[PDB]
Amino acid sequence: TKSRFFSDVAETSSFVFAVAGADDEVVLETIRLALKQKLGKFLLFGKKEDKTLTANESVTWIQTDTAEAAAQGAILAVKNKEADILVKGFIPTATLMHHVLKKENGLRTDQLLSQIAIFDIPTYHKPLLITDCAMNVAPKTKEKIAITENALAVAHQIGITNPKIALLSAVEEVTAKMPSTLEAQEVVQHFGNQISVSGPLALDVAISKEAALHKGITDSSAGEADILIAPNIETGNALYKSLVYFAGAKVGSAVVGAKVPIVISSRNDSPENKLASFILTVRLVEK
Amino acid sequence: TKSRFFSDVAETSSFVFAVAGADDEVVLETIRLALKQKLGKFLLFGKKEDKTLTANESVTWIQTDTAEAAAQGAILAVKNKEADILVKGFIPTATLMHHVLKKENGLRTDQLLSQIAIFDIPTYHKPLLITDCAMNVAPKTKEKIAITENALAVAHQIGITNPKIALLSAVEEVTAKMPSTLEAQEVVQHFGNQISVSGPLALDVAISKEAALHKGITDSSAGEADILIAPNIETGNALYKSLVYFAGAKVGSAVVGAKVPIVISSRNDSPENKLASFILTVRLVEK
Numbered sequence A, B: 001t002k003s004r005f006f007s008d009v010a011e012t013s014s015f016v017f018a019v020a021g022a023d024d025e026v027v028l029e030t031i032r033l034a035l036k037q038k039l040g041k042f043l044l045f046g047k048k049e050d051k052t053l054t055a056n057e058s059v060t061w062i063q064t065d066t067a068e069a070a071a072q073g074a075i076l077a078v079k080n081k082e083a084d085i086l087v088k089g090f091i092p093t094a095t096l097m098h099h100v101l102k103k104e105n106g107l108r109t110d111q112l113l114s115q116i117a118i119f120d121i122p123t124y125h126k127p128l129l130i131t132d133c134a135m136n137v138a139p140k141t142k143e144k145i146a147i148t149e150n151a152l153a154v155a156h157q158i159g160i161t162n163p164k165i166a167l168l169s170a171v172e173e174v175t176a177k178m179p180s181t182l183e184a185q186e187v188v189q190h191f192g193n194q195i196s197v198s199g200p201l202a203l204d205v206a207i208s209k210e211a212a213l214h215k216g217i218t219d220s221s222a223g224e225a226d227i228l229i230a231p232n233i234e235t236g237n238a239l240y241k242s243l244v245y246f247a248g249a250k251v252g253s254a255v256v257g258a259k260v261p262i263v264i265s266s267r268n269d270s271p272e273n274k275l276a277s278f279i280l281t282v283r284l285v286e287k
Ligand code: NI
Pocket: A156
């Protein structure tokens, strides 16, 4: 038997999702699913109301004929404590973040923003957090620190014990030929022994006891990573997708580091994984 | 029912493997397995003979007390047409390649060398080639071309029809923020319509019809990639490992682009996957 982050017991909740661009089924489907299980309530900023959806007592529609004003309103709702979670609707991520990063809008803090995802992978025995798979493109040491910090906050917020973090690379030898290894090393040195952080580690070493041993790695944090820190966006994303498409993984994803959790789902995500993202952000709301 | 590259019918063969540093079980185990099914014959350059192994009529032992001379002999055996396949034994990859790349040793050609791997993934329906997962660290456009060229040669040599190639990235929007996308684009433009090459593509788009459609990608080469070209080593390697450790994949791997196929297996690989690498290189030998 394994540990699962997403159980068959529906998290319920009264938190408010502000949806920036509540249009198109790719956006609405997830909202329906949430309502079905009462995951929370919704503030919808959109062009064309779905009056079959907005009849729900937990739904309120805010007409916005502009993607600009759609992001703008959803952002302000959160700023004013009217919504707990920011959700990107049918608009570009660039448009949402342009407003999210606007300091006067008060969502930004000192932290780098980063995407993070939590996976239930049937061939793993516990939940796996992977970051950053969708936002930070080529983070260097400083950014990787912040990304790891955000991962830590997330682990703590959602009840992952004392997480084992693995800075991912292609090898565990630190070499000038492969900067990801060097940056991995310097991230590890930032934290020292404050947390269980290690790397550079290839993936096998990070999540397989057998592989570690075969590579002469003898501790008990190897093969048990709770959090992987991608070396670059392409690695994080490939990994994310292989888990979903080949490993049969269930995954919830969010952008963290702002005053509220942000959902930024992609067009390809299954309704189930997009719901899972809602659930994750609900689990991330600390009052 | 799916197509499998590695069948239950054992490829047999009379080709000769030259093993550079035939020592330690991590190296020998694979050789035993090959012998069991008569995959081919062996020229072993090693420190300490295994006389239980070398009694085999298909095995000949060449005493070498140096990793240097171990690589050196295995290389010369291939140069002289005494062996068909070069296998790295219990020595560093750096030591093997130092001799492999020595032009006077005649293994090198005009081509970039690259690692490539062929996967049978139960949740995919046909074999998947992924490159480069272990050698080229940060290939740019020129290198990615060569890598793709090597992939093409490999596809042709092993009977993969007209392969669909996908230049992998985190997104399909080409942007200056993410050079992998730009380089992907320029690789695609090198080939034009000579082959089915496309990208930048995130992984979902490359190997899932459903995902492509969800992203407004309407052809019939999407969701059917036969070959993925990694944007960088960390992505290729992560992908390789997730397939093995999470997707239950069977995988054979080789370094290609030299006069003979080269096996460079890692300490963590299962004996089965290492055998699979032997089989792949047997399949790669063209006389
Ligand atoms: Ni606490």
